Design a protein around this ligand. Structure first.
Ligand SMILES: O=C(NCc1ncccc1F)c1coc(CCNCCc2nc3ccccc3[nH]2)n1
Length: 429
């Protein structure tokens, strides 16, 4: 089987072994914050606000970094930084858990706060490196490797999204089984070793994939970074794909996902391990269905029409969701219907994100694949930070109707901007 040694599968394996470690470490840090500190939302909110702004700035700066340096060296350095940061965070977490009872009492609260700050800073560096790697792989190496064959590019993006989704719903399950079967102290260390092994194998894998395809080779102190930062954003406006980016960012700011806040809505109305597993499995299955639907629609239509159709479907079932909210024992109809609306919204959302990311891949000048995508991630996290602020503005279980109304309104605005883009770049239906 020459497929195993082929470049496409090498890149698939590289991204799979990267995202598995990423998701496992995210789950580990979230569980650490939940377990060590009884209060989390306040802190997890601090984590969100220190990740989002740092990404907002250093992501444009990284987009400057990606296109400037060597193609392979930048990716290797990104992998090194991400895995080393995760290693340091794991070591600090192991030292904290081992001395859980030795600093809550004997040491001053400043020591615990300093440990939390060190974890926050190192995890922020890790996530910044993860964003750098995501850019340099997905938005540049996929385009180069897939080449002019647009269908191959679409299939590669769909496959990467499918493995991302399956890993996103499997990694928490495996880590929870590990922690329950073993111990939080022992299981946490397993992540450090797994990330080190993945570091070595991923370094080898990237070195290999670079050799398989030669096309990849062809290509006071704060004044300069802001020269690029000012240049990077204004470059985004000049590009014809700006409205698509804005629409994707507005969709990115969306409460009606299945993250911690919808998990808390579940705590309030209905919540169980079986229910969580069933809902997340349905979400993953429907995301896979959305990816395959995106591929099918791209086979039938082009790209902009596919994005328009996916947005219409997502907005339709979010209209169904807001109908469910509108309609007043336990209202089992309302919560289950809201979840079904979220599931179909995930279908449409994955389709739309694939469309927009492919358009950003195929409609950007060669030398600015780094800055433009870095700014697009910066904007995504800008509106994600606004989402976090809206969450902490009304962190009340019965203050969720307004939040969901705002989320659906922002989805509508994003799809309106995408329709404006379709009209701008296409004069026919
Ligand atoms: O609704 C969802 N996502 C919109 C969306 N995303 C991506 C593509 C299309 C699309 F439409 C949704 C649901 O689950 C998830 C998976 C988690 N990502 C959340 C983004 C995030 N991760 C963070 C980590 C640290 C700090 C801030 C962070 N912000 N994403």
């Amino acid at each position: 089987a020459d497929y195993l040694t082929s470049a496409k599968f090498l890149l698939y394996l590289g991204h799979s072994l990267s995202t598995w470690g990423d998701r496992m470490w995210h789950f580990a840090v979230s569980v650490f914050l939940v377990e060590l500190y009884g209060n989390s939302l306040l802190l997890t909110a601090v984590y969100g606000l220190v990740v989002a702004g740092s990404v907002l700035v250093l992501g444009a700066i990284i987009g400057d970094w990606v296109d400037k340096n060597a193609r392979l060296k930048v990716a290797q350095t990104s992998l090194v930084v991400q895995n080393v940061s995760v290693i340091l965070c794991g070591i600090i977490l192991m030292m904290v858990f081992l001395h859980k009872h030795e600093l809550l009492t004997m040491y001053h609260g400043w020591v615990l706060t300093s440990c939390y700050i060190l974890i926050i800073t190192i995890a922020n560096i890790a996530n910044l490196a993860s964003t750098a790697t995501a850019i340099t792989i997905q938005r540049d190496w996929i385009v180069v490797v897939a080449g002019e064959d647009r269908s191959k590019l679409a299939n590669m993006n769909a496959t990467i999204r499918r493995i991302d989704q399956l890993t996103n719903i499997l990694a928490p399950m495996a880590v929870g089984q590990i922690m329950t079967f073993g111990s939080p102290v022992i299981g946490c260390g397993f992540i450090s070793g797994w990330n080190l092994v993945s570091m070595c194998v991923e370094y080898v894998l990237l070195w290999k994939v670079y050799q398989k395809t030669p096309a990849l080779a062809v290509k006071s102190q704060m004044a300069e970074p802001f020269r690029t930062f000012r240049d990077g954003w204004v470059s985004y406006y000049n590009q014809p794909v700006f409205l698509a980016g804005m629409g994707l960012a507005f969709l990115y700011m969306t409460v009606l996902g299945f993250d911690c806040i919808t998990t808390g809505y579940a705590y309030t109305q209905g919540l169980s391990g079986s229910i969580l597993s069933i809902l997340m499995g349905a979400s993953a299955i429907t995301g896979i269905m959305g990816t395959v639907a995106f591929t099918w629609l791209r086979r039938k239509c082009g790209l902009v029409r596919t994005g328009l159709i996916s947005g219409l479907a997502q907005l339709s079932c979010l209209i169904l969701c807001v109908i469910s909210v509108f309609m007043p024992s336990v209202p089992i109809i309302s919560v289950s219907l809201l979840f079904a609306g979220v599931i179909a919204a995930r279908i449409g959302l994955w389709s739309f994100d694939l469309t927009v990311t492919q358009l950003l891949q195929e409609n950007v000048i060669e030398s600015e694949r780094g800055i433009i995508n870095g700014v697009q991630n910066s904007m995504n996290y800008l509106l994600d930070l606004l989402h976090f602020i809206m969450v902490i503005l009304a962190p009340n279980p019965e203050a969720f109707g307004l939040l969901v109304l705002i989320s659906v309104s922002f989805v509508a605005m994003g799809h309106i901007m995408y329709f404006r883009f379709a009209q701008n770049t296409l004069g026919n239906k």
